C-alpha cells in the first residue's frame, strides 16, 4: 500500500481516486488518497518525511516549494526513473521549475496562473480596459450580487499588480542569470503603488469588502452571484460541475502601472518521498499520472494546463487551453529557491495590513515587509 497526499477536490480529486483504483488493478498495489489542505502540506511533508510520518507521494506540489523541500532532503530525485523521450516532450519552463541542484526533483504535470474568469451570464465579452472593467464591476455590484471579488489578502493572487507597477519577479537576477535573494523587487516604490491600488480596490472603487478570502469569492462565483473573479484553473473543475459558462481573459492593467498586468506561472508536479518504504511502486504510480492521456483527462475534468508539448497541442482548440495560452506569456514563473518560503508570510502580512484600514502607512508597511524578509533570509 502506498499513500498519496493531495490538495485536490471535486472533479480533480475524482480523477486522482480513479487513477488510484486503476493502479491497484494494473499493479496489485493499494493506493490510499489522503486529502490535506494546500496550505498545510509543505510543513507536514518536510517535518514528517524524515520521521517516517509523510505520504509516499504528493500529487501535486507547486514548484515554488522545490528548493526548500530539496534542502530538507525530503524529495526523491526522479531523473534516473524517466526516459529522454518523456523529458523531451516537457515544456522547458516546467523542467526548470522542478530542477534544483542540477537535478530533476519531481515530475512536472500542469501549468497554471490566475486570470480574469468571467461568468457569461453577467459578462458576454471581456472588458477591454481598466475603465470598462471598473464601470462594469461597480454596475453589477448591488444588494446580493457582486461585480468583482478575489482573495485580496493573498500575495500570490496580487503579484500581477506588483508586476504591473514594476516588479519583474520577486527577486532581481544576478550577475548572469541566477536570482539574488538579497535584492527584492516587490518593495520600495513598486510595493507602495501596488499596495495603494489594492487598498483602492476596497476603499475607493468599493469592489472588495472586508472578509473576502478565497472561499468567499470562489463560493460566490460557483453560486452564480459573481460576475468576475481573479482565480486560476484549479477552480474550473467546480465551475464546470456547477455548469457556469465562463470565459478566461487577462486581468486589466491597474491605473498608474507602467507595465502590463502579468501573473505568476506555477507548475504543479508529482514528488516522491525520499523516505518512502515503497519507492518502486510510488514512482511507477507517479509515472501513470503524467502520461499524455492522463494529463488531458485531468484538464478535461478540471482545467490546469498540461506541461506536455504533445498533450497541449492536442488541446490547442479547447477553450480553457486557448484562454490560458493568451495569459501565460504575460507572466513570470515563481522562483523555486529555498528563500521563496520566507517571502510569502511578510508579503501577505503587508497586504492584509494595507487593506485593514484607509489610514494605513503604505510607505512604512512596505519598509517593514522588506525588513522582515531580509531578517528571515539572512
Ligand atoms: O499565498 C501564498 C502561496 O502562493 C502560492 O500558492 C498558490 C498555488 O500555487 C495555486 O495553485 C493556488 O492553490 C490552490 C490549489 O491549486 C487548489 O488545488 C486548492 O488547494 O486551493 C489553492 C488556493 O487556496 O493558489 C495558491 C495561493 O493561495 C505558492 O505556491 C505557495 O507556496 C504560497 O504559500
Asked whether residue 81 falls in the same domain as residue 218, the answer is no
Q: Are residues 104 and 149 in the same domain?
A: no
d(CA 116, CA 134): 13
For the chain, list the strands marked E by DSSP: 2-6, 31-35, 57-62, 99-100, 103-104, 107-112, 115-119, 146-149, 171-174, 178-184, 226-231, 246-249, 264-272, 305-306, 332-333
Buried b (16+ CB within 10 A) or exposed e, 50-74: eeeebbbbbbbbbbbbbbbbbebeb
Given a contact cutoff of 8 angstroms between Cβ atoms, the answer to whether 34 and 4 are in contact is yes
Query: C-alpha dihedral over 13, 15, 20, 25, to 10 degrees?
Result: 160
Reduced to 3 states (helix: H, G, I; strand: E, B; else coil), residue 229 is: strand
Instruction: Give the closest residue to 235 by CA, choosing from 373, 85, 117.
Output: 117
d(CA 71, CA 149): 37
All cell numbers assigned to 52 = 517516517
Q: What's the CA-to-centroid distance between 58 and ligand 1, angstroms?
A: 14
Run of H or E including 92:
helix 92-97
For residues 344-369, b (16+ Cβ closer than 10 Å) or e, as one string? eebbbbbbebbbeeeebebeebbbbb
Whole-number Å distance between alpha carbons of 263 and 286: 28
Burial class of residue 133 (count of CB atoms within 10 Å of its CB; 0-12, 13-18, 19+): buried
- Residues 6 or more apart whose CB falls under 8 angstroms from that of 197 comprise 161, 165, 254, 255, 256, 257
Contact 338, 63 (CB under 8 A): no
Q: Are residues 171 and 295 in the same domain?
A: no
Give the Cα separation of 6 and 352 in Å (integer): 28
First-to-final CA distance of the chain: 42
Q: Are residues 254 and 376 in the same domain?
A: yes
Count structural domains, the chain. 2
Q: Could you give the angle at the alpha carbon of 264 between the alpha carbons of 261 and 268, nearest 5°? A: 150
Do residues 148 and 42 both lie within one domain? no
For residue 295, the enclosing domain spans 1-113+263-335
Question: Could you tell me if 100 and 70 are in contact, meaning their C-beta atoms sit under 8 angstroms apart?
Answer: yes
Question: What is the distance in A from the centroid of ligand 1 to the CA of 38?
Answer: 7
What is the CATH classification number for the domain harbouring 364?
3.40.190.10
- Which residue is listed with cell 524524515? 50
Structure method: X-ray
- Regarding whether 103 and 176 lie in a shared domain, the answer is no
Residue 364, C-alpha cell as written in the block: 512604512
Whose C-alpha lies nearest to ligand 1, atom 21? 38
CA distance 112 to 187: 25
Q: 297 and 224 in one domain?
A: no
Same domain, 208 and 322: no
Candidate from 217, 234, 346 with most ligand 1 atoms within 8 A of CB, to mutate: 234
Q: Chain-centre distance of CA 284, in angstroms? A: 26
Pair 162, 251 in one domain: yes
- 70 and 153 within one domain: no
Asked if 45 and 92 sit in the same domain, the reply is: yes
Helix 155-165 crosses helix 340-356 at what angle (to 10 degrees)?
A: 80
171-174 and 146-149: which strand pairing? unpaired
Q: Which of 334, 331, 372, 363 is nearest to 96 (CA)?
A: 334
> Sign of dihedral through CA atoms 180, 62, 223, 250?
positive
Cβ < 6 A, ligand 1 pocket: 7-8, 38, 62, 64-65, 112, 154-156, 214, 232, 234, 266, 344, 348
Same domain, 257 and 121: yes
CA distance 106 to 55: 15
| DSSP conformation letters of 143-190 | SS-EEEE--TT-HHHHHHHHHHHT-SSSEEEETTTEEEEEEESSSHHH
Q: Mutation test of ligand 1: which of 117, 156, 213, 350 has the most ligand atoms closer than 8 Å to its C-beta?
A: 156
Amino acid at each position: 500500500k502506498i499513500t498519496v497526499w493531495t490538495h485536490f477536490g471535486g472533479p480533480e480529486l475524482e480523477w486522482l481516486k480513479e487513477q488510484a483504483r486503476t493502479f491497484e488493478r494494473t499493479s496489485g498495489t493499494k493506493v490510499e488518497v489522503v486529502e490535506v489542505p494546500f496550505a498545510e502540506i509543505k510543513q507536514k511533508f518536510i517535518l514528517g518525511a524524515p520521521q517516517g510520518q509523510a505520504a509516499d507521494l504528493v500529487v501535486t506540489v507547486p514548484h515554488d516549494w522545490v528548493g526548500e523541500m530539496a534542502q530538507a532532503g525530503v524529495l526523491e530525485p526522479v531523473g534516473k526513473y524517466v526516459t529522454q523521450a518523456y523529458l523531451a516532450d516537457l515544456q522547458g519552463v516546467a523542467v526548470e521549475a522542478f530542477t534544483f541542484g542540477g537535478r530533476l526533483m519531481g515530475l512536472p504535470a500542469f501549468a497554471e496562473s490566475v486570470a480574469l474568469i468571467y461568468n457569461k451570464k453577467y459578462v458576454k465579452e471581456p472588458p477591454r480596459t481598466w475603465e470598462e472593467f471598473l464601470a462594469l464591476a461597480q454596475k453589477l455590484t448591488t444588494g446580493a450580487t457582486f461585480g468583482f471579488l478575489y482573495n485580496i489578502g493573498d500575495p500570490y493572487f496580487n503579484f500581477g499588480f506588483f508586476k504591473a507597477f514594476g516588479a519583474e519577479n520577486v527577486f532581481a537576477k544576478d550577475a548572469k542569470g541566477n536570482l539574488d535573494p538579497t535584492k527584492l523587487l516587490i518593495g520600495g516604490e513598486v510595493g507602495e503603488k501596488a499596495l495603494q491600488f489594492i487598498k483602492d480596490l476596497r476603499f475607493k472603487y468599493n469592489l472588495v469588502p472586508e472578509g473576502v478570502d478565497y472561499g468567499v469569492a470562489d463560493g460566490a462565483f460557483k453560486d452564480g452571484a459573481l460576475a468576475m473573479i481573479l482565480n486560476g484553473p484549479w477552480a474550473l473543475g467546480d465551475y464546470k460541475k456547477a455548469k457556469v459558462d465562463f470565459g478566461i481573459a487577462p486581468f486589466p492593467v491597474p491605473p498608474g502601472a507602467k507595465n502590463p498586468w502579468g501573473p505568476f506561472l506555477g507548475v504543479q508536479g508529482v514528488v516522491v518521498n525520499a523516505y518512502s518504504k515503497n519507492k518502486t511502486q510510488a514512482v511507477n504510480f507517479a509515472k501513470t499520472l503524467v502520461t499524455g492521456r492522463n494529463l488531458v483527462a485531468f484538464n478535461q475534468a478540471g482545467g490546469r494546463i498540461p506541461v506536455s508539448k504533445s498533450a497541449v497541442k492536442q488541446l490547442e482548440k479547447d477553450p480553457v487551453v486557448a484562454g490560458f495560452s493568451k495569459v501565460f506569456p504575460l507572466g513570470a514563473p515563481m522562483p523555486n529557491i529555498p528563500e521563496m518560503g520566507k517571502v510569502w508570510g511578510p508579503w501577505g502580512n503587508a497586504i492584509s495590513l494595507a487593506i485593514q484600514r484607509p489610514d494605513s502607512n503604505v510607505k512604512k508597511i512596505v519598509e517593514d515587509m522588506v525588513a522582515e524578509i531580509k531578517k528571515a533570509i539572512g
